Amino acid sequence: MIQQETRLKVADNSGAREVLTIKVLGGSGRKTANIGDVIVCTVKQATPGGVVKKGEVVKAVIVRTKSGARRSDGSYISFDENACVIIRDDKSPRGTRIFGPVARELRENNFMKIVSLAPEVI
Amino acid sequence: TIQWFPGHMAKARREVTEKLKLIDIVYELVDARIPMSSRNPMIEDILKNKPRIMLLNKADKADAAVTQQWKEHFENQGIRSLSINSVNGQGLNQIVPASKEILQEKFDRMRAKGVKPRAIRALIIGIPNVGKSTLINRLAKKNIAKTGDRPGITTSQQWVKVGKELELLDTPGILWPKFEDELVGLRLAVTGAIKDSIINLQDVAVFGLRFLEEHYPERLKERYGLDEIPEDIAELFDAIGLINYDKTTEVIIRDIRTEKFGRLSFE
Amino acid sequence: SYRKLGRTSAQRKAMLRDLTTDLIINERIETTETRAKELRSVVEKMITLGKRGDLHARRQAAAYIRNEVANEENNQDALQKLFSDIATRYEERQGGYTRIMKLGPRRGDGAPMAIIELV
Amino acid sequence: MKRTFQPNNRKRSKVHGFRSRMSSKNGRLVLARRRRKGRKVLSA
Amino acid sequence: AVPFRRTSKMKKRLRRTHFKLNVPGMTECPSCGEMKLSHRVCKACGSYNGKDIN
RNA sequence: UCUACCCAUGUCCAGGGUGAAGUUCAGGUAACACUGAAUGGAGGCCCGAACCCACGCACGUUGAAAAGUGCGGGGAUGAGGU
RNA sequence: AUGAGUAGCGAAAGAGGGGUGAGAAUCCCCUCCACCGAAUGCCUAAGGUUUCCUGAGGAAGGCUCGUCCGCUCAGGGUUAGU
RNA sequence: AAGGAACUCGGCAAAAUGACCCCGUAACUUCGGGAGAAGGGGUGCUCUGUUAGGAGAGAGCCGCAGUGAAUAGGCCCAGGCGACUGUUUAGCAAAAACACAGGUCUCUGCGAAGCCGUAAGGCGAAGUAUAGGGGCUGACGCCUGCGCAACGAUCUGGGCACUGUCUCAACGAGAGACUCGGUGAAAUUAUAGUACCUGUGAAGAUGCAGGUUACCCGCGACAGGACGGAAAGACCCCGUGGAGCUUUACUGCAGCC
RNA sequence: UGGCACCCGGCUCAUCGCAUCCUGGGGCUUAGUCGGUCCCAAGGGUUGGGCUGUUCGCCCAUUAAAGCGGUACGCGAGCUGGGUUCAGAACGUCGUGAGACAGUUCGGUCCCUAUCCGUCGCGGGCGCAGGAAAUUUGAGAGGAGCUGUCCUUAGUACGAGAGGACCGGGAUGGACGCACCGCUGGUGUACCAGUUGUUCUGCCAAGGGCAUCGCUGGGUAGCUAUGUGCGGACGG
RNA sequence: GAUGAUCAGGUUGAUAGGUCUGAGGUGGAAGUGUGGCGACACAUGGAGCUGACAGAUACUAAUCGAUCGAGGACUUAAC
Numbered sequence A: 001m002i003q004q005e006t007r008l009k010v011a012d013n014s015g016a017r018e019v020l021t022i023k024v025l026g027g028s029g030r031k032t033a034n035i036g037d038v039i040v041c042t043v044k045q046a047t048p049g050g051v052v053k054k055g056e057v058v059k060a061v062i063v064r065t066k067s068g069a070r071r072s073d074g075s076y077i078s079f080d081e082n083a084c085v086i087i088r089d090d091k092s093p094r095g096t097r098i099f100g101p102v103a104r105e106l107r108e109n110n111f112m113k114i115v116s117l118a119p120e121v122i
Numbered sequence B: 001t002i003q004w005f006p007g008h009m010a011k012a013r014r015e016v017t018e019k020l021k022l023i024d025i026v027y028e029l030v031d032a033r034i035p036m037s038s039r040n041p042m043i044e045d046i047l048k049n050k051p052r053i054m055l056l057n058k059a060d061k062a063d064a065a066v067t068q069q070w071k072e073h074f075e076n077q078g079i080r081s082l083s084i085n086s087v088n089g090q091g092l093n094q095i096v097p098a099s100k101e102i103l104q105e106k107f108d109r110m111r112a113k114g115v116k117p118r119a120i121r122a123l124i125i126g127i128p129n130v131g132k133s134t135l136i137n138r139l140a141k142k143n144i145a146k147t148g149d150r151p152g153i154t155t156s157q158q159w160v161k162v163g164k165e166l167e168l169l170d171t172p173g174i175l176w177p178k179f180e181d182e183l184v185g186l187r188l189a190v191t192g193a194i195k196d197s198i199i200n201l202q203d204v205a206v207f208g209l210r211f212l213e214e215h216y217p218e219r220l221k222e223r224y225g226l227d228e229i230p231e232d233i234a235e236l237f238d239a240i241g242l243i244n245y246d247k248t249t250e251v252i253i254r255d256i257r258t259e260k261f262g263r264l265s266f267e
Numbered sequence C: 001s002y003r004k005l006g007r008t009s010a011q012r013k014a015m016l017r018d019l020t021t022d023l024i025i026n027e028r029i030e031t032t033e034t035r036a037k038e039l040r041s042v043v044e045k046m047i048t049l050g051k052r053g054d055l056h057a058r059r060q061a062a063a064y065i066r067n068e069v070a071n072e073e074n075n076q077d078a079l080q081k082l083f084s085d086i087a088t089r090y091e092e093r094q095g096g097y098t099r100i101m102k103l104g105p106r107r108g109d110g111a112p113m114a115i116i117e118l119v
Numbered sequence D: 001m002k003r004t005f006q007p008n009n010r011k012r013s014k015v016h017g018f019r020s021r022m023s024s025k026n027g028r029l030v031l032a033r034r035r036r037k038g039r040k041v042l043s044a
Numbered sequence E: 001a002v003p004f005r006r007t008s009k010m011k012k013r014l015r016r017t018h019f020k021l022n023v024p025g026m027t028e029c030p031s032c033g034e035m036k037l038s039h040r041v042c043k044a045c046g047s048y049n050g051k052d053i054n
Numbered sequence F: 001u002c003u004a005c006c007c008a009u010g011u012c013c014a015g016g017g018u019g020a021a022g023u024u025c026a027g028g029u030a031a032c033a034c035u036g037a038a039u040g041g042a043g044g045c046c047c048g049a050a051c052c053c054a055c056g057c058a059c060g061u062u063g064a065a066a067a068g069u070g071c072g073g074g075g076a077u078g079a080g081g082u
Numbered sequence G: 001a002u003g004a005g006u007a008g009c010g011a012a013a014g015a016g017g018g019g020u021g022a023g024a025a026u027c028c029c030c031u032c033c034a035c036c037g038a039a040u041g042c043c044u045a046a047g048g049u050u051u052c053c054u055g056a057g058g059a060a061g062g063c064u065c066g067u068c069c070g071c072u073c074a075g076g077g078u079u080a081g082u
Numbered sequence H: 001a002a003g004g005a006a007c008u009c010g011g012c013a014a015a016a017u018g019a020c021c022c023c024g025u026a027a028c029u030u031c032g033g034g035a036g037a038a039g040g041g042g043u044g045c046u047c048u049g050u051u052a053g054g055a056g057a058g059a060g061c062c063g064c065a066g067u068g069a070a071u072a073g074g075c076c077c078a079g080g081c082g083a084c085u086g087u088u089u090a091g092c093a094a095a096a097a098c099a100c101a102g103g104u105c106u107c108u109g110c111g112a113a114g115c116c117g118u119a120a121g122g123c124g125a126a127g128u129a130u131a132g133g134g135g136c137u138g139a140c141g142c143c144u145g146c147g148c149a150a151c152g153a154u155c156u157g158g159g160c161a162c163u164g165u166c167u168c169a170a171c172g173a174g175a176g177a178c179u180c181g182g183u184g185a186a187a188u189u190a191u192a193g194u195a196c197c198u199g200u201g202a203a204g205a206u207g208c209a210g211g212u213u214a215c216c217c218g219c220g221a222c223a224g225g226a227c228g229g230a231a232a233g234a235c236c237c238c239g240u241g242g243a244g245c246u247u248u249a250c251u252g253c254a255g256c257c
Numbered sequence I: 001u002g003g004c005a006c007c008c009g010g011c012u013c014a015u016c017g018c019a020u021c022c023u024g025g026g027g028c029u030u031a032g033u034c035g036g037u038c039c040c041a042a043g044g045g046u047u048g049g050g051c052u053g054u055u056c057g058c059c060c061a062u063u064a065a066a067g068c069g070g071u072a073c074g075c076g077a078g079c080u081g082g083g084u085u086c087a088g089a090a091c092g093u094c095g096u097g098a099g100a101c102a103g104u105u106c107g108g109u110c111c112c113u114a115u116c117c118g119u120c121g122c123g124g125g126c127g128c129a130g131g132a133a134a135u136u137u138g139a140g141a142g143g144a145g146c147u148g149u150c151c152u153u154a155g156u157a158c159g160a161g162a163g164g165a166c167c168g169g170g171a172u173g174g175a176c177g178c179a180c181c182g183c184u185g186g187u188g189u190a191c192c193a194g195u196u197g198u199u200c201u202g203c204c205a206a207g208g209g210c211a212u213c214g215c216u217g218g219g220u221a222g223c224u225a226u227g228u229g230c231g232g233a234c235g236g
Numbered sequence J: 001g002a003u004g005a006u007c008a009g010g011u012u013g014a015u016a017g018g019u020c021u022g023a024g025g026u027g028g029a030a031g032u033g034u035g036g037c038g039a040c041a042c043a044u045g046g047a048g049c050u051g052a053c054a055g056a057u058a059c060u061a062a063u064c065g066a067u068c069g070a071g072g073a074c075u076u077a078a079c
């Protein structure tokens, strides 16, 4: 359950290592987000030189959460950290690599490229 | 980016406009290190049909040659300019005669009109964190205004009667509501004049380092006990030490404003 | 749910331990009705423990029975009486061993009193 | 908190006693007034 | 809050309408006892409809 | 006999730290002042109980109390408390 | 008189069995349990002036009850050359 | 649970560190400090083992957790103000206000100068210009204004730790509330058989006019009205009402010449 | 010894008007995509933050939209000095002395057991032409009423082209509401284990008391949301 | 469920407690053997313990009795 002022950690090789959310898109008074949603965030930790810079405002997709997703058949999934991938408005990976496991829910949200680049999908 | 513009700044403009009539002469304080970017067009639009003089305070921290060149550029532009050091009176003696020469026309007109000459009314205006109050305290020798090493000390305009000769008006610093050119904002943030808790210090440090590498490579070489000019910033940061990954940015900006380096200017 | 009897848990356990060993000695006591209804659940459990009889059961009841003289001449305490000549009395009777016998209220505070005794 | 009255027998007799009243003239006037009214107890 | 006005006798008497007691449960004398209470002992000898106790 | 100041006589302060002057050996010297080592126990010095205050919050405000209680806080060998 | 049989009954662990008695949750005895213990221990100041001990009592006072009391009646009790 | 200041004037409140040893410690400085700076590591039990003389080292054995419960410092940056320790409005203000060590001006030759008293008589002092009264400032280093080293329940701003402050509340314990037995007050009170809506009215209607609703009596809760109750009020005039205060308003008695 | 006009912000709860911000229905002026303007309509909805004294205020990011107003600031016997607003202090400006201005700043005490009318719940009487037990009709009243994307229609209407409707179908969200504990979690003080100090059952082993339930790891029933099911669809 | 009230029962009966089987929770009981110098490990044994949840079983309590509660008004039309 990600919300305002929640610090995630990027899982791609763009140069940003930690972001802080600003708003959750997709509703008049929406206040929570889960796996497979899109958020707007500000970069809080980045290398002095690189593609992205500190203080920049971007948007990302959540891929891991402490509380996972209740699947249809009654199975549950859960991770140990909250991670996001920075994207463009056309839903493509801004970086080149995806690190760590990636939830399968992304596949049903037409995030095909991220799923393809992921090493292991659970 | 940089947006700092509280409500007292907004009230200052209205107060200055409402008390414009009494003003005889205007002093516009401008930092010497950044003479062009430190000017405020917003307050200049309000200020017209009034003689004025450009003042360059904190002139000890800037290079003499560039300041003198800028003084020439202001002089042949069509405005009088001077270089002043507030903390120790360097050029403070040669401002009363300049004011007298400027206002002599109205002074003689009034004298021939049949009244005794009166005191000169001056208004001091400029951006925050410049010697707007230290200059007044030096001029009055009284230490009557409050001064500090951070922007935003005074909050209300005040009248100061220096003898029977001057009536000075002080004013809190004023910034334009929205910046346009990011380089000017970066320079202003480097020199101070901003609360420094609203901006990104890392970008300021990066700008300082790249400007130094471009202009004063030798001063960057000497630095503080290390001699290298690599491509990134992490080489110099971890000189003297988990250590602060990038909090050393503050250190980079800490010494420069205190002139640990030699005198320099950004122009 | 269990009644609270208007006391903290530690004091409630203390009262229960006191009363359940006062009853075994005397074989009939007089209390308040709402306090004797909450008591019938523990005495019968202790009686079942006594009917079991093995060593493990005896050490279980030793944590819920206070040290009092009970009979004087032959010097047998409450635990020995419980395991000796009470389990022998209720040998073929399975189920309740106690009887609750109501009577009137008392002068001081009008609480309804009752008498509880072994069957 | 300390209340204003902290009893003590010696000071009472030294200040409001019979001999203290009789020592000066105003004390004698006080004794005369109390005798005139008829109070059962006088001095202290 | 303090009362705005005193209350007349009629209002007080009407308020005390439901403030009364109840006639107790009356049963037979147990073992020639004295008119004992329902589901309780005889006053004479603690009898239960002749079943004396205590 | 409460509180302000003064006078003469008594009395109280669990424990633990830091280590001034002075002294001795001594690189240094021709010996210093300065190195270190040992000894030494100064201070309106430090942490903190009894004792004395009264900075924050909450309760109480026809109160247990006509200035209190609970949890934190300041001084605690001195221009001290009694 | 109304408010009204309303607010309150002033920090805290008691349970059972015997006894007296016209009347017992509250008085006496016994056994367990529980709290303080740098005192909620003992001894002796200022101060109080019969409150101390024994036998009787149930009007009034004990924020309830009372066969009990620092309450009401009768008696008794305080010994210094250190 | 998830998040971790998003609340708010403000991290107010609560949460978090805390004990014994062993390593390691910055800028600055009045060279004494800062400093327990900041940061790391180890604690249980058994044998070796009169352990050398009470170790230390070694080997081992358990739990999620070893100062296993109670009591023991939260830390780091930047600006004002005051040098410091102390003292103040008992009962609204503990501070930047008072005092303070140092500096400076002025009077005083001894029956001193000043004070208390009508006077006698005293303090100053049994002391004598390196000593006493009365003013002004207020450490010590740099000028005739500039330095914050050390201290602070001081005023402003920032960053870590950490959390029910909150997104958004949910359970649980105790003392009240509620029922029964005993005892049992107070502020207030012109008499009342005491609805609502649009009007009227000294101008803000349970009581007046027109209409609409409403069987009699209680118990547990909320606080819109009775311009609700108590400090006559939590404040604007006026007292040709007082007191206090200042004299180029007068007139008296003090002292001095 | 001039001239001539006027007579407090925040919290918790809401309710009403239309002079309509969005959604519905229309003329229009406007290829469509759109946009502008003017009528009819009050049913529902109408946001989170950073600097800030929220001002004669700046910015960030969303949403179909971030409407204007009345009700003794709507609302203190419901809550907050947080502005206003006192006795202690610094600087100031004016003044011939008793003082004048607040121009800036730091600190700084009010309470209330609900009598009546009102609202929200729960009972006791009697009435209703014979006494009772069930099941009911419905004069009346209250509740609900919101919207976005995506696929088809088919790039078909159009538009030389680029570019593009659309309300008939079909899916699926946001916010709000009503139920419930089968699942994921929370609490769960008479449930089960580990462990520190001290004291007790004559001692060893077994146990009891006290230390916030002594402290830690779990946790059944019940109560619960952050969990699960359903709703606002039309139609006359 | 604040108290009244409502609902399930009163000995042709499963309303409550107890007892016996279960379901969940915890996680390998006491005693006795074996191995080790000892702290400890293994076996007997998914062991022992179990508030509120289920199914059986009258073992203990729901005995007595008391109180209340109708005989259907009048007129006119269709018998």
Ligand SMILES: Nc1nc2c(ncn2[C@@H]2O[C@H](COP(=O)(O)OP(=O)(O)NP(=O)(O)O)[C@@H](O)[C@H]2O)c(=O)[nH]1
Pocket (backbone or CB within 6 Å): B057, B058, B059, B060, B061, B084, B085, B086, B087, B127, B128, B129, B130, B131, B132, B133, B134, B135, B146, B147, B148, B149, B150, B151, B152, B153, B154, B155, B171, B172, B173
């Ligand atoms: N070196 C140097 N410092 C100067 C000079 N003038 C002023 N300063 C520094 O600037 C600070 C004071 O600046 P100040 O005049 O108060 O700035 P301001 O514009 O008045 N700020 P505000 O208006 O908000 O009160 C001090 O740190 C002072 O040392 C100068 O000429 N040289």
